[PDB]
Design a protein around this ligand. Structure first.
Ligand SMILES: Nc1ncnc2c1ncn2[C@@H]1O[C@H](COP(=O)(O)OP(=O)(O)OP(=O)(O)O)[C@@H](O)[C@H]1O
Ligand SMILES: Nc1ncnc2c1ncn2[C@@H]1O[C@H](COP(=O)(O)OP(=O)(O)O)[C@@H](O)[C@H]1O
Length: 1353
């Protein structure tokens, strides 16, 4: 626990000061070693030492005064939900409404003043304008605008002053949880203390020693010195606790030296003890550094409220009170509202703004004196108050009278921090290194057997191997965008502190990835270059290595720029995919620079990979003569030949040559000239530098954070215009015990628990964290999977059946609903699937309307659930949860887990009122309650109080004012309950884990031996004597409803569908028009092969775009719908399949139309008289490919938990399939080992069939440079000369069969002969289609099976 600078921390800070000064030496009030030390002065000295630099004019302390502070913002309309059809018009409308609005008064004029060293607390129900006030007084006024009369002064400096010259002294923190998960607390603080060492003025101690001491004192002051070596952690990363993480925020801003602070959601997710610790850390900072700190908080504890100097109270943007915290209660008591004895003053002030919870004074209503009731009247009363006169007499008097370290040091310290991140999360780094190296080994091994010979038969494979080398080197670095997005929030926070240039963070993040890039570019390249057997000269190898290093750095900087412009990785996967396709496909291998069309030659000219690949090919081919592999006149009749009467079958060949010069081959095929060897390096370095600087400039400026109104979405159709079933049976349990085996061998978590719930009764379940409240609720609701349960649960004395889970409603604490569904649609979905099938749908609709009316939500009964930020809010989301569990007509009970937790006192009271209403309608509610107020506690009928380990201490009716419980506890030697004490806190103090957690005795024993225990046992015996289809709907009906809901999710998911379709359109149109009418020359056929190959590379983006949808539906299902027995996993998976399939078919049809015809396959079909059949088969293959991408996404996401891991696995499998497809290396040249991968990969059959359907059954038309030129023997024309050869090699043709001087010879006479080399046959098209369909079926079946394995209990 943290007690706010208590003597412990004074001693520990003296220890730290002794350490520092002894190290350095290697007035007595400030001397660590001599007696009479004062740690408070010591730390305070440091505050001066960093603030009072004679060269930095930062103020010692900033107050704040503000009068007439009005804040207004653009009115909040109802934004109709975006669907996949209406979003284009929405976009156009938004564009016209942004180029060519009425306002809402967020905050009515306010006054106030916060002096240095004071704590201000802002109270008010959500929506009252607390966040806007904090942003206004801290000058973070973006998304709204202040009035012309607003006068705000920071002890002389205007808002326009701190906004420029002192920004970072005035800080607003919407959250105190944003941190870097993998840095330890000490690392997180020492990096900041290094960036904030006034190092030009400290003498006698190394800058690092002083930074260490400063971070150590910051941990000591704020109670974190135990977490020195613990990872700061996160929600998903275990580490320090939430309270300790918020105190790390406090210590970090303390080191940063801010003077005016605002904490908006300070104690979100914190129980009273931890929230009080946080407020105590703020108080410690206030009196150690003189920092005025404002906070907005909910359910402020009285012990936490006492710490606050001043209170501001808001109501609908009106200021009802501003003054000392200890006078607010009395001020509102004079106004005419009476505080119930057991109400904390924070709760009293916040409830005075709640028409249904205020207790107006009757005495002043006897004499008929006016009491303001509406917020306008309360403000009109305050402005007339005498307290307002005092406050203004102070505010008037108050108004009438960049970085500590250089840029290089900032870069150095942030680089050290980045390395700390790397070695604290090394696993990802090792994954990158080893995955790249192993892909190197595999893919290079694929090239092992063919490069040994070194003949001219290896030229295409040399091209393709160099293509692989450059692509892999270029795109290896792309995993660091994850770290970029992970660090952006922290960079923004540290920017709002005048802590460092964001350019410094960008530059340091670039530098921290160099070691990984070099390790990869060494290991991968050594393995690949050795195995692929490129030129063995050391010089050429090192030139290759340098080119690859330049490639990786250029692409890393380009995609850092691309990621910088985007907000989330999902928003970047589309443009990044477009750039990836362009760069990869115009690199010079998929389409030689000769073959590129006039419309897209500029792409090749601006592609750094193009020049780098040119340099690589020049390096690999230049100057080495390759012996010939086969000459075109061949066989028996062609043994006696003169040199000039036979060529090599390769582009650069010359008749009579024993070899081909690689230079000629590249000049002819690619048009690369040795004079361009070093141009590629120069241009690559130019782009490296330019995009590095663009990345810095983008990270420096293009950032922002804007405010937004709480907007309901209300689907467009709406926007155009705009009883209960009694719980029937008693439920009870007896001698219930529970055990697990995970954290220990037979670790008990519920121990001899017993009790009951009856119709029309509200029973609270209480106990400190742990104590198995949620565990007991899960055990009773038959909701647990692990552990074993003994003791008997019963309904009317009979064991609970196997249909029991459908008779109980269980409202989970962390409610989760389909974010696209509306409230009414969600309720009706719940009713349609859970209520009995014999009930008509009209009756279910009527009941849903009745439930909507009961819970008071017809004002938002057609609102979209949305997210926590937009759509519904916490209160309305909890109301929807309760309604969803109610609309299933639970026969027996409604279990509620912590329905109030996380809310403010007024909405928690509204929830408790709803629960009491339901218990009055006839329901039987057993709700778990966490740290309730006395007013909330009063509403409950019965109480079941447990100790840690689920040891029941008191079961019974608590009675009025909790008097029965108080009497039971007092009558057994408990210390009495003070008349102002909350009874729940009192009983957790009597026995529990509350601060002061010592119990004079163990009260489980007292219960066991009590009178009430025997009363409970007698009643439970009498109930035992009183006793005298796993789903509600058929699997088909469940699948119908679930698939309908998923279709309504895809529709209304415009981002997913439109990213899918525009990615398909761009990628496929770009492939089609890059190879626009590629023709039927020998290079044309190869270009069409590589085009059909590029068609597949849309695999990964489509799968990754898809996976989040399944993950969302899966989270909803597993969390809520599975335990509720709403529908079976069969229905869930079949919906995930049926919905995905049609959209993928549509995408495949679009791709077919924009790919088949532009590339020219249709003319190839027509010339063969096979137009319609080949077109239909090509369209079938396109649709099958997209359906296959969907099915493989399902297969990988079925058993994987996170989407990213499933995407990585799918990418690995697709890489294997594509690499061994037989296109980058023919199976003949493949090593004997890898043929299995060439047989099992679906893309072999897909691409073989698709290229056969594209180019087969037409005549080859060799281009001028492709034709072989030689001369015939004496006296015979080339027809006679070549006739014997054509007799055997039944393919090839002569341009002039009768020519006698020199003849041009094309190897292949028909595209079928070329395809046979690729092993693609037009006779196997339908067989290959069948094989691909079987692949799709296997994917879906295996995905269903793996979901049943890894996920279904
Ligand atoms: N442009 C705008 N900016 C901010 N709020 C706006 C705007 N337009 C309307 N509002 C509304 O004004 C009210 C101001 O409340 P504000 O969000 O400032 O405090 P709060 O919501 O009580 O605090 P918290 O965000 O901590 O819950 C909100 O209900 C919001 O929906
Ligand atoms: N991984 C686990 N395996 C087995 N039991 C667990 C595990 N995690 C938590 N528990 C048990 O479940 C309890 C958490 O739920 P519970 O305590 O009922 O919620 P609350 O703390 O709100 O009452 C813990 O006290 C612990 O005894």
């Amino acid at each position: 626990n943290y007690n706010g600078f208590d003597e412990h921390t004074e001693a520990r800070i003296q220890k730290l000061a002794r350490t520092l000064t002894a190290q350095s030496m290697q007035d007595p009030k400030l001397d660590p070693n001599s007696e009479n030390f004062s740690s408070a002065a010591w730390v305070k000295n440091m505050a001066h030492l960093s603030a009072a630099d004679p060269d930095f004019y930062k103020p010692y302390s900033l107050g704040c005064a503000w009068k007439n502070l009005s804040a207004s913002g653009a009115s909040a309309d109802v934004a109709y939900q975006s669907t996949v059809v209406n979003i284009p018009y929405k976009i156009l409308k938004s564009g016209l409404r942004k180029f060519q609005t009425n306002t809402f008064q967020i905050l009515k004029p306010m006054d106030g003043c916060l002096n240095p060293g004071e704590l201000l607390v802002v109270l008010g129900r959500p929506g009252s304008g607390c966040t806007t006030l904090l942003k206004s007084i801290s000058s973070n006024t973006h998304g709204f605008d202040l009035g012309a009369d607003t006068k705000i002064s920071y002890s002389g400096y205007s808002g326009d002053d701190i906004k420029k010259h002192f920004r970072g002294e005035v800080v607003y923190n919407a959250e105190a949880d944003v941190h870097l998960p993998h840095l330890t607390v000490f690392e997180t603080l020492v990096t900041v203390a290094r960036l904030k060492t006034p190092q030009n003025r400290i003498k006698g101690v190394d800058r690092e020693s002083y930074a260490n001491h400063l971070a150590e004192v910051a941990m000591a002051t704020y109670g974190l010195s135990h977490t020195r070596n613990t990872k700061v952690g996160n929600d998903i990363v275990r580490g320090v606790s939430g309270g300790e993480r918020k105190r790390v925020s406090i210590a970090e801003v303390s080191i940063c030296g801010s003077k005016f602070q605002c904490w908006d959601n300070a104690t979100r997710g914190l129980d009273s003890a931890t929230a009080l610790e946080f407020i105590r850390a703020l108080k410690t900072q206030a009196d150690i550094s003189n920092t005025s700190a404002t906070v907005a908080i909910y359910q402020c504890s009285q012990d936490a409220y006492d710490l606050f100097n001043k209170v501001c109270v808001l109501d609908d943007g009106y200021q009802i009170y501003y003054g000392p915290a200890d006078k607010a209660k009395k001020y509102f008591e004079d106004m005419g509202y009476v505080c119930p004895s057991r109400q904390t003053t924070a709760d009293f002030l916040t409830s005075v703004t709640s028409p249904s919870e205020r207790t107006l004074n009757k005495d002043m209503l006897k004499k008929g004196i006016h009491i303001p009731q509406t917020p306008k009247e309360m403000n009109d009363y305050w402005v007339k108050s005498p307290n307002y006169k005092e406050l203004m007499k102070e505010v008037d008097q108050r108004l009438l009278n960049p970085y500590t370290v250089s840029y290089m040091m900032q870069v150095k310290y942030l680089l050290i921090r980045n390395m700390w991140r790397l070695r604290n999360n090394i696993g990802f780094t090792l994954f990158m290194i080893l995955g790249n190296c192993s892909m190197a080994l595999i893919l290079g091994s694929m090239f092992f057997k063919i490069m040994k010979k070194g003949d001219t038969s290896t030229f295409y494979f040399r091209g393709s191997a160099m293509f692989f080398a450059i692509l892999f080197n270029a795109f290896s670095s792309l995993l660091e965008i994850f770290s970029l997005y992970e660090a952006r929030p922290i960079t923004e926070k540290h920017r709002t502190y005048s802590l460092y240039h964001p350019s410094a963070d960008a530059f340091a993040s670039v530098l921290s990835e160099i070691p990984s890039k070099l390790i990869i570019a060494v290991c991968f390249n050594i393995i690949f270059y050795f195995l692929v057997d490129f030129r063995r000269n050391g010089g050429v190898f090192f030139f290759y290595l340098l080119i690859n290093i330049v490639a990786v750095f250029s692409m890393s900087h380009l995609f850092r720029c691309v990621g910088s412009l985007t907000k989330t990785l999902s928003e970047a996967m589309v443009p990044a995919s477009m750039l990836l396709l362009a760069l990869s496909m115009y690199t010079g291998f998929a389409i030689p620079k000769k073959k590129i069309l006039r419309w897209s030659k500029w792409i090749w000219y601006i592609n750094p990979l193009a020049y780098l690949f040119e340099s690589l090919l020049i390096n690999e081919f230049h100057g080495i003569k390759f012996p010939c592999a086969e000459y075109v006149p061949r066989g028996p009749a062609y043994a006696n030949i003169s040199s000039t009467e036979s060529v090599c079958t390769v582009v650069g060949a010359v008749p009579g040559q024993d070899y081909v010069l690689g230079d000629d081959f590249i000049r002819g095929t690619y048009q690369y000239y040795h004079k361009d060897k070093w141009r590629g390096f120069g241009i690559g370095m130019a782009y490296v530098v330019f995009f590095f600087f663009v990345y810095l400039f983008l990270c420096e400026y293009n950032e922002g954070a804007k405010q937004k109104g709480e907007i309901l979405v209300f689907p467009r159709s709406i926007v155009k215009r705009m009883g209960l079933s009694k719980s029937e049976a008693i439920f009870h349990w007896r001698n219930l015990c529970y055990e697990v085996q995970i954290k220990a061998e037979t670790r008990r978590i519920l121990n001899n628990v017993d009790g009951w719930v009856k119709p029309g009764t509200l029973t609270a379940l209480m106990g400190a964290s742990g104590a198995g409240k949620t565990t007991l609720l899960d055990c009773l609701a038959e909701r647990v999977t692990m552990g074993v349960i003994t003791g008997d649960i019963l309904v009317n004395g009979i064991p609970r059946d196997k249909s029991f889970p459908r008779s109980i409603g269980y409202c989970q604490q962390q409610d989760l609903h389909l974010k696209t569904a509306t409230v009414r649609e969600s309720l009706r979905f719940s009713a349609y699937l859970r209520q009995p099938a014999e009930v008509s749908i009209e009756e279910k609709n009527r009941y849903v309307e009745e439930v909507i009316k009961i819970l008071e939500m017809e004002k938002y009964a057609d609102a979209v659930v949305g997210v926590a930020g937009e759509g519904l809010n916490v209160e309305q989301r909890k109301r929807l949860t309760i309604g969803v569990e109610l609309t299933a007509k639970p026969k027996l009970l409604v279990f509620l887990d912590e329905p109030t937790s996380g809310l403010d006192s007024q909405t928690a009271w509204s929830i408790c009122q709803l629960m009491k209403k339901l218990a009055n309608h006839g329901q039987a509610i057993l709700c778990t309650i966490h740290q309730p107020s006395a007013i909330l506690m009063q509403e409950f009928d019965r109480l079941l109080f447990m100790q840690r380990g689920g040891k029941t201490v008191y079961f019974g009716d608590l009675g009025e004012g909790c008097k029965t419980m108080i009497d039971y506890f007092e009558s057994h030697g408990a210390h009495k309950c003070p008349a102002d004490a909350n009874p729940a806190e009192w009983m957790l103090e009597v026995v529990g884990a509350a601060p002061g957690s010592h119990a004079n005795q163990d009260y489980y024993e007292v219960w066991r031996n009590s009178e009430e225990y025997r009363a409970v046992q007698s009643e439970l015996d009498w109930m035992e004597r009183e006793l005298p289809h796993e789903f509600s709907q058929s699997i088909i009906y469940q699948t119908k409803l679930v698939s309908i809901r998923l279709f309504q999710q895809y529709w209304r998911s415009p981002d997913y569908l439109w990213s899918k379709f525009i990615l398909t359109i761009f990628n496929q149109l770009f492939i089609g028009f890059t190879f626009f009418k590629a023709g039927t020359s020998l290079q044309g056929l190869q270009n069409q092969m590589l085009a059909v190959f590029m068609f597949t590379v849309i695999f990964n983006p489509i799968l990754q775009q898809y996976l989040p949808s399944f993950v969302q539906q899966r989270d909803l299902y597993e969390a809520r719908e599975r335990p509720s027995r709403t529908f079976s996993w069969i229905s869930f998976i079949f919906a995930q399949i049926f919905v995905e399939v049609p959209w993928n078919i549509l995408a495949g049809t679009i791709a077919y139309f924009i790919y088949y015809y532009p590339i020219g396959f249709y003319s190839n079909a027509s010339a063969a008289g096979q137009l319609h059949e080949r077109g239909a088969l090509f369209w079938l293959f396109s649709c099958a490919f997209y359906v296959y991408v969907g099915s493989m996404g399902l297969l990988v996401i079925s058993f994987n938990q996170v989407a990213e891991s499933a995407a990585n696995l799918a990418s690995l499998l697709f890489t294997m399939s594509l690499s061994f497809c037989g296109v980058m290396t023919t199976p003949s040249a493949m090593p004997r080992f890898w043929i299995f991968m060439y047989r099992v990969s679906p893309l072999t059959y897909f691409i073989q069939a698709l290229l056969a359907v594209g180019v087969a059954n037409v005549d080859v038309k060799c281009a001028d440079y492709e034709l072989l030129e030689f001369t015939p023997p004496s006296g015979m024309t080339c027809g006679q000369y070549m006739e014997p050869y054509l007799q055997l090699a039944k393919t090839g043709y002569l341009t002039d069969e009768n020519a006698t001087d020199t003849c041009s010879f094309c190897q292949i006479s028909t595209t079928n002969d070329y395809l046979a080399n690729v092993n693609s046959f037009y006779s196997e098209r339908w067989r290959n289609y069948g094989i691909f369909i079987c692949y799709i079926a296997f994917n879906y079946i295996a995905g269903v099976f793996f979901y049943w394995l890894a996920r279904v209990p």
